[PDB]
Amino acid sequence: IPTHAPKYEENFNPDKKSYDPDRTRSEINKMKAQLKKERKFTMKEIRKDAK
Amino acid sequence: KKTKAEVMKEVIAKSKFYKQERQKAQGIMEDQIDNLDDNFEDVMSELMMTDLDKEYDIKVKELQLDKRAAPSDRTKTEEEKNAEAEEKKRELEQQRLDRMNGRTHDALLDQVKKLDLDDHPKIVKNIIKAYQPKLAEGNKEKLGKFTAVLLRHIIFLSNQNYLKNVQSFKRTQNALISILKSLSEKYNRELSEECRDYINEMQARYKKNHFDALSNGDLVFFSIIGILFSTSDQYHLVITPALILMSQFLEQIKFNSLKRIAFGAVLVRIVSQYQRIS
Amino acid sequence: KVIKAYTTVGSILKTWTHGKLPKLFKVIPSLRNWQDVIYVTNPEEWSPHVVYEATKLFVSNLTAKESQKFINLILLERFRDNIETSEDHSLNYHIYRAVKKSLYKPSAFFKGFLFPLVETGCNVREATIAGSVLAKVSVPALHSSAALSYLLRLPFSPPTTVFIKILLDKKYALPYQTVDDCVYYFMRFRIGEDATRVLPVIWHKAFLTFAQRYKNDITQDQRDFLLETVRQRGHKDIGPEIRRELLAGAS
RNA sequence: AGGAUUGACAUUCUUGAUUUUGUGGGUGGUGGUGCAUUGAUGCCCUUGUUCUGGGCCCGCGCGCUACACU
């Protein structure tokens, strides 16, 4: 039978975003999701303080 | 915690050792430079000026007088030598099995050494090989050239005059094939190029003529290549184009006389002698 | 005198690590004042690179006159102190390269260093180490025979003769100086030593290692006293290969 | 020793057969174990000198759009 090795990430944790090689389009997803979550928390903070 | 403790301790200790070495080098350069540049006035005005040695001088005189050399720098142990010789024979057989599964321009030896036919010629060739290996200061080019004219000497000697009787050319060709195989077993770097020259010459001649200049040296060439090489291995640039060219001779040119059929028959029995071990 | 900063320069040469010689100590061998250099330099500053420059220094400035001036001053005394303080019984790297580089002018090295090494109580182990260290490099034949002549006309003693045992484990050539040094070493050990001086099987192994192939093209007197050897001092390990080689040998 | 080689006052001078041009081949204990505390002493191997090192203690669910010889 034709035999294939896996495509495996050693020390992989699904909660935490690992070291993907794409500096061009994946760390941009990292920092943009960071920016989205902090902008969401800031607008939630200011609207509850407005209330 | 133990990692951090020993790690910070070793890192600070290595940094302290590097700082101490740098301070010692700075003090070295400082004192040495500011003292060597300052001592230019007192590196001029500072001025202050048996039987065993005699017999040692006499022994050095005797040593420069008498000089010799040790024979073979080891021991000739019989059991170790026999084991290495058996392993060398097994290495030769296993290499043959693993490879079977895988100013001398063509007239110098006749101009110098060849006195009558053969007898003085091979002895003077031995004299040339003894004089060249003696005073071989740096020798590759001339060694290749006179081994080339040795093979030249046999390829225009062994064809014309075998007319002198049987045991005479028998013993001179036997001594020649023995010394030439035992001399050219350890090397290939000139016999290979001479074999390229000979396959060029026999292919070109066979294209040139019908039969009337097919020389008698082809049989001697096949004999010397079968003696100097074991033909068992497949991948060999030397023995195989000559064998396909003798098969080309047999398949193409015509044998309309008894000596021509005898020529074909001796080439068939010598390829049978090749396949005796191939 | 000199520039007077040399107690400080010795304090730095105590423990500075990577570099070469100062230009002061480089211009004094063209001068004549390294006596008054070293008498204020106070030679305790033995760092490995300055030992390397020291051995190249005095074997550069080793001729007969200055060799007998300062050939026995501090050097093998420092070797005595370092080996007496060493417990692993091993050659140090600066020791090895010191003597191995000190051989590089054997014009008077073989008369100035190989000769005074038995000055105050030398040991068989010391002769073994010195034989191995100066054995591992190529020596010239005339210089090695110049050392060996005086070394072998010295008497029969183990810290003198296991050095000669390693000198024949070096497996030299055979000039006629080696032949006549061999005949008087043979007359040095034979049967007033017959009651007090004994000889064990390590020196039988020494006999094996020079009688291995020290019989190339030599005469019949050698055969005479080597048949005297096989009659007098035949151990069990001396027989087969040696008698085979005596039968195979010729004149 | 008629330029065989050895430390250079940023080539340029105060060194003398350590040798080199062509080629054979040999290695290694300075670690220590077993015996009297110096005896071809069984055993894995042979070919020990100088600076810097390394992250940390989002989860959930709803919608919308995919992944389909339907």
**Is residue B252 within 8 Å of B235, Cβ to Cβ?**
no
DSSP B197-241: HHHHHHHHHHHH-SSTT--THHHHHHHHHHHHS-TT-S--TTHHH
Burial of C19: CB neighbours in 10 Å, binned 0-12, 13-18, 19+: middle
**Is residue B250 within 8 Å of B230, Cβ to Cβ?**
no
**Is residue C140 within 8 Å of C106, Cβ to Cβ?**
yes
Give B-chain residues touching C36 at CB under 8 angstroms.
Answer: 46, 48
Burial of C93: CB neighbours in 10 Å, binned 0-12, 13-18, 19+: exposed
Category of C4 on φ-ψ map: left (φ > 0), alpha (ψ -120 to 50) or beta:
left
Strand D lies under 7 A from the Cβ of residue A37: yes
How many Å apart are CA C32 and CA C26, to the nearest integer?
12
DSSP state of C213: T
Can you say how many angstroms the Cα of residue C26 is from the centroid of all Cα atoms in its chain?
28
Give B-chain residues touching C141 at CB under 8 angstroms.
Answer: 63, 67
Which amino acid makes up residue C169?
D
DSSP-derived 3-state class of residue A50:
helix
How many Å apart are CA B39 and CA B17, to the nearest integer?
32
DSSP C51-119: HHHHHHHHHHS-SHHHHHHHTTSSHHHHHHHHHHH-SS----HHHHHHHHHHTT-TTTHHHHTSSSTTS
The residue in chain C having the minimum alpha-carbon distance to the alpha carbon of residue B71 is: C216
**Is residue C224 within 8 Å of C187, Cβ to Cβ?**
no
Strand D lies under 7 A from the Cβ of residue C152: no
Give B-chain residues touching C212 at CB under 8 angstroms.
Answer: 75
The residue in chain B having the minimum alpha-carbon distance to the alpha carbon of residue C243 is: B77
Q: In chain B, which residues from 97 to 156 place their CB closer than 7 Å to nucleic acid strand D?
A: 136-140
**Unique residue bearing structure tokens 């000559």:** B242
How many Å apart are CA C74 and CA C28, to the nearest integer?
18
How many Å apart are CA C32 and CA C19, to the nearest integer?
24
Tell how many helices (H) and how many strands (E) occur in chain B.
11, 0
Strand D lies under 7 A from the Cβ of residue C23: yes
Q: At what angle do helices B258-275 and B239-252 cross, to 10 degrees?
A: 150
Cα angle vertex C217, ends C212, C221, to 5°?
85
Q: Which of B62, B77, B80 would best serve as a mutation to test chain C binding (most C beta carbons within 10 A)?
A: B62
How many Å apart are CA B101 and CA C153, to the nearest integer?
64
| Contacting residues for B185 by C-beta, under 8 A, at least 6 apart | B228
**Unique residue bearing structure tokens 């001779």:** B249
Can you say how many angstroms the Cα of residue B51 is from the centroid of all Cα atoms in its chain?
52
**Is residue C20 within 8 Å of C7, Cβ to Cβ?**
no
**Is residue C220 within 8 Å of C233, Cβ to Cβ?**
no
Contact C32 B52 (CB under 8 A): no
Task: List the end-to-end C-alpha distance of chain B, in Å, as a whole number.
Answer: 74
- Nearest-CA residue relative to C1' of D48: C93
Q: Which of B136, B111, B112 is nearest to B124 (CA)?
A: B112
DSSP state of B158: T
Q: Which of B213, B211, B237, B207 is nearest to B225 (CA)?
A: B237
CB atoms within 10 A of CB C182: 19
DSSP-derived 3-state class of residue B45:
coil
The resolution of the experimental structure, rounded to one decimal in Å, is 3.8
Q: In chain B, which residues from 179 to 218 place their CB closer than 7 Å to nucleic acid strand D?
A: none
Query: Quick check: C15 contacting B, CB < 8 Å?
Result: yes
Run of H or E residues at B251: helix B239-252
**Is residue B118 within 8 Å of B157, Cβ to Cβ?**
yes
Beta strands of C164-203 (E only): which ranges? none
How many Å apart are CA B36 and CA B38, to the nearest integer?
5
**Is residue B255 within 8 Å of B263, Cβ to Cβ?**
yes
| Half-sphere exposure at residue C235, Cβ-oriented, CA atoms within 13 angstroms | 12
How many Å apart are CA B245 and CA B227, to the nearest integer?
19
Shortest distance, CA C19 to any CA of chain B (angstroms): 8
DSSP state of C172: -
DSSP-derived 3-state class of residue C181:
helix
Burial of B155: CB neighbours in 10 Å, binned 0-12, 13-18, 19+: buried
Burial B123-153 (b: 16+ CB within 10 A, else e): eebeebbeeeeeeeeeeeeebbbbbbbbbbb
Burial of B83: CB neighbours in 10 Å, binned 0-12, 13-18, 19+: exposed
Nearest to B63 among C17, C146, C212 (CB): C146
Token pair belonging to C148: 């060996």
| Half-sphere exposure at residue C124, Cβ-oriented, CA atoms within 13 angstroms | 8
Category of C84 on φ-ψ map: left (φ > 0), alpha (ψ -120 to 50) or beta:
alpha
Query: Quick check: B54 contacting C, CB < 8 Å?
Result: no
The stretches of B66-162 forming alpha helices (DSSP H) are: 78-100, 108-112, 119-134, 141-155
Give B-chain residues touching C217 at CB under 8 angstroms.
Answer: 68, 71
Q: Which of B156, B158, B180, B161 is nearest to B108 (CA)?
A: B156
**Is residue C185 within 8 Å of C145, Cβ to Cβ?**
no
Count of residues making up chain A: 51
Nearest to C12 among B31, B39, B66 (CB): B31
Q: Which of B158, B14, B40, B100 is nearest to C24 (CA)?
A: B40
Token pair belonging to C10: 């010795």
Query: Quick check: C32 contacting B, CB < 8 Å?
Result: yes
Strand D lies under 7 A from the Cβ of residue C37: no
How many Å apart are CA C197 and CA C189, to the nearest integer?
9
Report the distance from CA of residue B94 to the C1' of nucleotide D17 in Å, as an integer: 49
Query: Quick check: C22 contacting B, CB < 8 Å?
Result: yes
Query: Quick check: C65 contacting B, CB < 8 Å?
Result: no
How many Å apart are CA B266 and CA C191, to the nearest integer?
74
Report the distance from CA of residue B176 to the C1' of nucleotide D26 in Å, as an integer: 34
How many Å apart are CA C84 and CA C158, to the nearest integer?
19
Enumerate residues 173 to 212 of chain C having a beta carbon within 8 A of any beta carbon in chain B: 173-177, 212
Strand D lies under 7 A from the Cβ of residue C204: yes
Cα angle vertex B158, ends B153, B160, to 5°?
110
**Is residue C149 within 8 Å of C177, Cβ to Cβ?**
yes
Token pair belonging to C6: 């040399």
Which long-range contacts link B263-272 to residues 24+ away (Cβ below 8 Å)? B263/B214, B266/B219, B267/B219, B267/B222, B270/B219, B270/B222, B270/B223, B270/B226, B271/B243, B271/B246, B271/B247
Token pair belonging to C102: 């000190």
Inter-chain Cβ pairs, chain B and chain C, closer than 8 A: 126
| Contacting residues for B21 by C-beta, under 8 A, at least 6 apart | C16, C17, C18
DSSP state of C30: T
Token pair belonging to B176: 């020649």
**Chain D positions with a protein C-beta closer than 7 Å:** 6-7, 9, 14-19, 21-22, 24-26, 29-32, 38-40, 48-54, 58-59
Identify the experimental approach: cryo-EM
Contact B56 C111 (CB under 8 A): yes
Token pair belonging to B81: 């030598």
Give B-chain residues touching C66 at CB under 8 angstroms.
Answer: none
Q: What is the dihedral of CA B195, B201, B202, B204, to 10 degrees?
A: 140
Burial of C149: CB neighbours in 10 Å, binned 0-12, 13-18, 19+: buried
| Contacting residues for B53 by C-beta, under 8 A, at least 6 apart | C64, C111
DSSP state of B180: H
How many Å apart are CA B229 and CA B233, to the nearest integer?
10
How many Å apart are CA C187 and CA C171, to the nearest integer?
21
Token pair belonging to B198: 């000979």
Task: List the end-to-end C-alpha distance of chain C, in Å, as a whole number.
Answer: 65
**Is residue C165 within 8 Å of C131, Cβ to Cβ?**
yes
